[PDB]
Design a protein around this ligand. Sequence first.
Ligand code: YHL
Length: 386
Amino acid sequence: RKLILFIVFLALLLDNMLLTVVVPIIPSYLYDLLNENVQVGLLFASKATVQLITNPFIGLLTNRIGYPIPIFAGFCIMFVSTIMFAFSSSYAFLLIARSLQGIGSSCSSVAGMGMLASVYTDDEERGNVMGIALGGLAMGVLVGPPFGSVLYEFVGKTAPFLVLAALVLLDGAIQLFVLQPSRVQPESQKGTPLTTLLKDPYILIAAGSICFANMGIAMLEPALPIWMMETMCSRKWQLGVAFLPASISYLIGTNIFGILAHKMGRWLCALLGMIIVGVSILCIPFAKNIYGLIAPNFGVGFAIGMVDSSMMPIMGYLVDLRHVSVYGSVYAIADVAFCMGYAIGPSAGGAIAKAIGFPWLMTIIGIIDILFAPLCFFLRSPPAKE
Ligand SMILES: COc1cc2c(cc1OC)[C@H]1CC(=O)[C@H](CC(C)C)CN1CC2
């Protein structure tokens, strides 16, 4: 059980490190405080809209053949994408590699959380373990951009991707020796169909709380001033620094609240997280400086980690309670909810910021987050099966 948790942690860590190592490199491929960028928006939306599409199939797939094979396929796709990045001399193949990374993320984020849920059947154990696993995502996002900047400038253009490929090969060897995916291992019972789970209001509440928490940051990041050419020409260090606050805060929030959400109550933890997300992004329109975004980014990361640590275990809890205890489809739903913000926001936020304005966009997103929060009260005591 320890080694499965370590494998999931490492998979998410390297996934989100490959996700973000490209940040210092992106400006070289395309060359008010917040202005939306189409070409950055496409880089954000490609992986997310391929992972969202892939997610339901992985939920259905893990029922047929079990979890280890999709996890190993996620590793394979991650390695192939990492190799393709190191030799992508064009923007369109950057998009292609992002789509491949989306497929791999779908695999290793649906089947890894499903295996965590199935291996840790205790509710409190599952909460703690999933908090650690999401801390892995936070660590990957933390490490990515600075590693990319250091190796890109002081070693060479291809060095960060080759080193990351070596790390991914180590991850694959660990998965080979632990999971041994050579044999098809179907689930012990047929899971509840996806259409029936989507008709459950409480799973909808949890998925909505997961989804709306990510909307504001999903619409903020493609609009950051760091993509402007003055950063590439003079201010390069901001490309590495800009994602540190949210990563640190998300890491701390997930680590503490994986433990704390069970004692406090995951409904109350998610409600407070949603309120804090709504309030912290309402403070973004106040910023007239890039340094003004540091505190709202820290608050947003902390509260998003809080919401995730509250809501990821209850996805397994709700199927253990009201449905058949098979975890692939509920985490397909949860990952669809997570990816929907980064899939839609880079386009919808740009259109809305053109229509009414970006400060009003962030204001409305925060207001929506605040208004959604009372719905978490329904998760306090859901009824069981008949
Ligand atoms: C360069 O591309 C991307 C960069 C980034 C993200 C997504 C991207 O592409 C889809 C997300 C990842 C998270 O979940 C992050 C959530 C927590 C770290 C708060 C937010 N940001 C980090 C940077």
